[PDB]
Design a protein around this nucleic acid. Sequence first.
DNA 1: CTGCGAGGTCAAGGTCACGTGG
DNA 2: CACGTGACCTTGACCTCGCAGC
Lengths: 30, 30, 390, 390, 487, 487
Amino acid sequence: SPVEIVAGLLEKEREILSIMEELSELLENE
Amino acid sequence: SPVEIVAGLLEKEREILSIMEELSELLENE
Amino acid sequence: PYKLPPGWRWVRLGEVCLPTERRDPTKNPSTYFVYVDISAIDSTVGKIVSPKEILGQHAPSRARKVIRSGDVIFATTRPYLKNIALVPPDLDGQICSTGFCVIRANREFAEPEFLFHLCRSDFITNQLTASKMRGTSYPAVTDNDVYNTLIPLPPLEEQRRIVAKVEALMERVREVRRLRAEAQKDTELLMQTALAEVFPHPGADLPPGWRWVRLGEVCDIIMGQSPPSSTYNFEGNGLPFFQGKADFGDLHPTPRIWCSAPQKVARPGDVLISVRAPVGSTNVANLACCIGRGLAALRPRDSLERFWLLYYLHYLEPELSKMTFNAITKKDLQNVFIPLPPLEEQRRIVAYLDQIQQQVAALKRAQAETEAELKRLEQAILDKAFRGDL
Amino acid sequence: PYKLPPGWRWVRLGEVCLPTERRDPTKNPSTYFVYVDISAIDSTVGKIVSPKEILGQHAPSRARKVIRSGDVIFATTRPYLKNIALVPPDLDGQICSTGFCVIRANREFAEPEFLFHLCRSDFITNQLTASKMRGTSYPAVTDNDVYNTLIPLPPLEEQRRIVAKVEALMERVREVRRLRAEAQKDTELLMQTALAEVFPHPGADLPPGWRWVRLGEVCDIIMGQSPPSSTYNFEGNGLPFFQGKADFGDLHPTPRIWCSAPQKVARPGDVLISVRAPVGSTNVANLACCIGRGLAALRPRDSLERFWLLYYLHYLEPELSKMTFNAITKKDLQNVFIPLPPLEEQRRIVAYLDQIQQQVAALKRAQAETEAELKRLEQAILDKAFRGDL
Amino acid sequence: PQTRESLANEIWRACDIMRRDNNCTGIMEYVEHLAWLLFLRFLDAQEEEWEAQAQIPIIDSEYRWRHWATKDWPADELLAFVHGRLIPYLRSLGGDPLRETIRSLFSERNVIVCASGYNLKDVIQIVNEINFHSQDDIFTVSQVYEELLRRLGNENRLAGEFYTPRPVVRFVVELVDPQIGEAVYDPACGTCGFLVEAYLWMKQKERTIEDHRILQERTFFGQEKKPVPAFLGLVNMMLHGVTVPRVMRRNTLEENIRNVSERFDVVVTNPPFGGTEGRHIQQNFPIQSNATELLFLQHIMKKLKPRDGARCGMVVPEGTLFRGGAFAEVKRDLLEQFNLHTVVSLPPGTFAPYSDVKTALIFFERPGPTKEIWYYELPLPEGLKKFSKGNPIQDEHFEEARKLWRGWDAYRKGLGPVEACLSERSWIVPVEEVKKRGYDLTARNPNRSGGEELPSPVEIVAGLLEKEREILSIMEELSELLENEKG
Amino acid sequence: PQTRESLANEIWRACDIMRRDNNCTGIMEYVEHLAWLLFLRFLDAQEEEWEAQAQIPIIDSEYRWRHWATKDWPADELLAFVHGRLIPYLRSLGGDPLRETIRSLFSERNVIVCASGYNLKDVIQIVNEINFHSQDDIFTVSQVYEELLRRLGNENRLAGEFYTPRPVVRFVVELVDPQIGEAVYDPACGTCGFLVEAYLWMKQKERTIEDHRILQERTFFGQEKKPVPAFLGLVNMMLHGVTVPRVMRRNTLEENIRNVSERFDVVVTNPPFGGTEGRHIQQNFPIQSNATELLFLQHIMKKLKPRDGARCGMVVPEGTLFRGGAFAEVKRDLLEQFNLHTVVSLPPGTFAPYSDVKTALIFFERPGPTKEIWYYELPLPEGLKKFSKGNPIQDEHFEEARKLWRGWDAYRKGLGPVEACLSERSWIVPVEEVKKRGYDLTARNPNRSGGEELPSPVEIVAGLLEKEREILSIMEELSELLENEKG
DNA sequence: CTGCGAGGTCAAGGTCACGTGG
DNA sequence: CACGTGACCTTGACCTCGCAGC
Ligand SMILES: C[S@@+](CC[C@H](N)C(=O)[O-])C[C@H]1O[C@@H](n2cnc3c(N)ncnc32)[C@H](O)[C@@H]1O
Ligand SMILES: C[S@@+](CC[C@H](N)C(=O)[O-])C[C@H]1O[C@@H](n2cnc3c(N)ncnc32)[C@H](O)[C@@H]1O
């Protein structure tokens, strides 16, 4: 499943990224 | 022995009295 | 709280103290130590008179507290009994019962004997009554109350060497009471010595006109018995009831209870003697009354003066009281032997002994009052001492 | 300690607290209770996840503290492990191990959740390191230090409401690391998946030119043995010595010790495989060295690429590792089966797998660093929070 | 009644007339002068009632108040009459015992008469302008008389010895709660005595014909030793008043206690703090001590009737409370024979200027033996160290004492909570502990500075001295008598 | 030596001549202008020595410093000569030896030359009035140059990048304690480098003839990438100075660490403070990361000789200390490969104006594995929030650091008590605890205020974002590559 | 093999209650 | 009887050993 895995991994990554720009969003404020 | 005893008793009494006029003696002062 | 002289400061007992150690002697099982417990203290003089030396192995659970020279040990169990003591150099660094509060005076602020004499006074113990229990039924207090009760601290602090004055005073004072005690003991035998002169021991020859006689001959006896308990009443029905010596006053018995149906009655002028322990006590009877089993009533016959018999019985009292358990019998009383002078001479000697007795009574009461006021004098010494009035 | 915003006050933690009860459940022997101990807390999220309900009769000696809704329980035994929890309503009024320090916030001053997040922070526990001992050797502290350690408390008493704001941040934050963990887990499987394609399962037939071959055929093996201990030296005499996997680096083994009289030597480019638990780990030899019995050295004949064999062994590693105690033998290694493509194709696939591996390594390290800085981000959240900076 | 204004003023005028006069030095002389005039007028009125009962001869007609007071004298002839033919005539009374009384009252020295015959005539006319057939006018004069007695109480340090503060009286009477008819006894009634207050109370309940007679005749028995308080008091009890009350000039210690006879339902009293009596009198008591107060205590103890509910309110000094010896014995007896249900510590100077001695109110009951004792310390105003001529004791302090005592009275009979009677100034002491203390009944307030305000040592050692050489005298007597009566 | 005298003062004069000039904007331009003149004079002197052993021509003869500097030029003709003929002649020598080297050093941008030919002539003659055969004068010029470099360090934020505070240097060199002869290496030597301090020190122990020639020939190996610090530094090491020092314009990261074969006893260094380099360079290292500082750390780790007592003093930022991932790995290796015996936390602004980043001095040793680490936090004066251009770091703060470190050095080999090296400012951290912290070597003071002066959270989330987008780039690269190489 | 924590022992007080001498 | 001493109980603190993880 090598190729499939990277995909899902990639989705997970840009999801995480989404979460942390929500983090930056709500952290200023400042 | 009745008579002797009052005697001796009397001696203890004048002794006690002496002690307590020395007590008053040193109590003023005050 | 108080008003105090310029030098004096009020500080909690604790503030003046050093922290104090406690150690376990069983950690040194073969090392002996001297143990001090509340029983080892003489309450009167506030000293440790009877320590006990114990092997560290056999050490009681209580023995955890270490004492040192100048320490004041203040018992926390009933501290109105004045078990308080100043620790001698001989007892330095040593263990006692945890029921003690250890007071280590730090000599910067307090010298120990002053604190001893403070604790010895009703002052601190009354602070303890103000706090804790007032009336609340428990005999003991924690160490930290005894660390929180207010006290005056007397700096300039060789001003607390006014302790010297106190001790000077006190010893002379205590000495007085010693002598007073001796006087009191001795004064009592005066009466008996007087009696010893008037009544000859048995089998001796007697002055002319006197004769030995059995009491039963010159006296008749009503033994007395206790009625059923229904008869007893406080509503004053029938006659007063006296079961035994407990009902006696020192001359006449005080009636507190009545018997609606009396069995054996004692008229006025009968002489009452206790027939059960304590045997031999006597009171005259001043009113018609009913007598219990604990009492026997002696009615003196014509040849006899009730006071002649009475004084005789006072004379005989010490081993007229023997000590299976002791009771005395009608026959026992009838066969006791009494000297019988003529009635007139009896009344004469009765008069003489009467004024002797009133004199020694007046005497008794006087020295008793002096003693009481010596206690009060002591309390006055301490109260006056702890404010600047010497 | 530091600056304060206008409202906030510095208060000792204890000053904000309520007195707290302790009771003995054996006094109610047939009454069940819920018990909470340090093992019942999840260190990561600071919750009580596993209480145990016990009959009051079977209550442990430590079971004596009553928790209540909003109480913060802070373990005093090693409180750097962050066993701290906020007591839910379900656990109100209940016993938990004495190991804990019970914090009952009086709502007049402090909201409990704020105190939870304060304790959850490295703040208070660093207070605990600063006092007590710095680096002395005892794991635990008394409850009353945890009552004396300074905290900043902010009034109102909305801000404690602010923390309510912190929860938002944290939730998102924890969620991130959740994903990161999963990512990391899965990311490593990539390598094996890639390998899964290149190496066929045994007994399948292979693309043309390839052939199955016994390792012994294309590889020759030097088993290795451990010398006497006199040979060992730090003065760099003879050759470096590697006993087992413990000496392995991530690619090449770091020599820390030498053997003055080597017995079995591994020349560079030999491939080293561990032969005892953990068995099957591989590392390559970058320098001439001596090998212990814990290692076997594989040296590849032509027709075999050291990296082809290496990647193969990496593929085989999970059940190349068996689990009586684990050891592998020369015959065992010689009779393992390996796919053998032409040498050039081997080096081609080796190149390809090499760049896959460099990419996933870079990847690994990257997300590892993100994880670490997420921890740091958390600590930054709390440090910034307990000052007026949000 | 109380037609104070027209009449009261005059009496006050008469007082200022005596102030002007030389031989009336002070308020003392005012009140006794007024007393003897008022008494003569009283005697005349009573005899007139007895003319009415004669229908169905205390003094010669010439010497009745009527004939000599009504006539308008030249002043000198009046003065000459009073000193020359009147007073000696009144010492001229030999007859039935009562006249012996009249003679008795005058016979003791030196009746107060104005130096100016004019002033004397004026005072006499003010007295003669009182209507004795109006109970209104009598009420007024009684009030003025009472105020005069109070002022006399404040100004004069010797009285003092025959006076007691009315707040103390009213309080004691209130706590004792006399009913009709139980006799009321003051074995030493200085002047008036508590008897007037007891009268007024028991009277506030009469409300029937039978009762009044009981009040006027059979309910007041008490006695006085010294002539001046005896007289002033007689005048006061007739003034308030009971028509002809029974109280005797006599010694209370005259009487033997074993004989007792007597006795009474109630004793409300303030016996003397008192000093020595000694000798013959001592033999009248089972316990014999020179101290007057102790003998008075014994007398009171046996003066009470045997019935349950036999009460005594009484005033005692520190001495009777803390002293041991015979006192303890008597005190022991009290506690065993009697139930002493309360003690009120009374601050120093309550009796000033007479004493400043700390005193206590002792209310002891006689159902039975004494178990628990209620102690109430009483507050001074915190401005004052002690009560004074300037600031005397008044009814209010006792008002608080009153409310707390109501609490204790409720608890004693178990009709109320203990919490009612307790306050930091109130505490309850169990009898065991007073017996451990050698019968020291002195007030020790737990919830108070430990200081017990004891007198300085020197005074203690002084009294101790005098009674120590008293002991020596006793022993001297003992050995004199023991070799005297040798055969 | 010294004799700054007239000579120092002049040089200062030249500086104000350049201050007046248009083409010298700031102290930067002063120091580089002075540098290129001084360097040419130096080259001429060295060759002249080589005439002396030629007896047993880099450029000539028109272009040697002798002929053109001695001449009295019309200003315009001088300026025209330098720009028109000389710089170009230098730009193109082409001799495979150095001579290429020389161009490399005239290779780029602006050679700083005065706008006024008059000023240029003045500065040139001030420079040629220096006697290079008197090392008193060389010493003087070295001192003035050093001060110029310090002032340059304060004024210009761009250096900054190639400068390090001399107190830091002297401290690091003092603690490392170089001896003769161990090679001394700075894998990035900004300008001068620690090499001058190392020189002067090792010189203070010089002792013998054989030694001096070791110092000037065989003991200084270090290197620099960027032209301006390379040049300024070259001038500085010949100034202090070493006759012909070995340092190369090159990249240390172009080198492949795994082949190593160059090693040194000592490394005293301050590598860059950290940005990306990437790609092809990355492959030179076993651990691969874009971060320059990490690669420099690796390079240093393998640049050390295998013998025991192999030392490195080094300057690192917060980042290298608290960052995980590859850093941790390298740090792990460090701690096991090496004994890291001290860390000195250096407060923010130490390097201002270049950066205020908090830094740490890392002295790590290489007998063996790392057991315990000595931490010394360093105090700011209580007046300042941070060190500044206005108030910079100076040798004193380090006086205290020095004394305590002497203590720690004593304890480490067990020649002294631990108590010597401890102050609330100094504490000792066990290696175990840094491994539970995920290899966070940041200073945490046990006996100190809680606040750890951590960045505002957002900055954290900002960096977190940028390297997350790096992660995305990496993954699409991954899928590009596995979809590319599909058969 | 090492760090964690729950069971255990231990010390400091504090309250309870039984033996016993006056 | 009521006074103390031995005992039991509680709180709070330190010891360390069975146990599961690197
Ligand atoms: C203090 S007073 C009583 C006060 C009185 N209750 C009142 O209302 O003022 C004592 C009085 O008792 C009188 N007294 C003293 N000795 C006495 C005695 N042996 N018999 C009778 N009365 C006596 C005194 O004259 C004095 O007036
Ligand atoms: C902080 S400085 C070194 C300071 C120097 N030790 C001093 O204080 O004298 C960093 C220097 O390293 C140089 N440098 C940066 N990257 C480099 C590389 N890859 N190779 C060599 N030198 C480099 C930079 O030009 C900069 O001058």
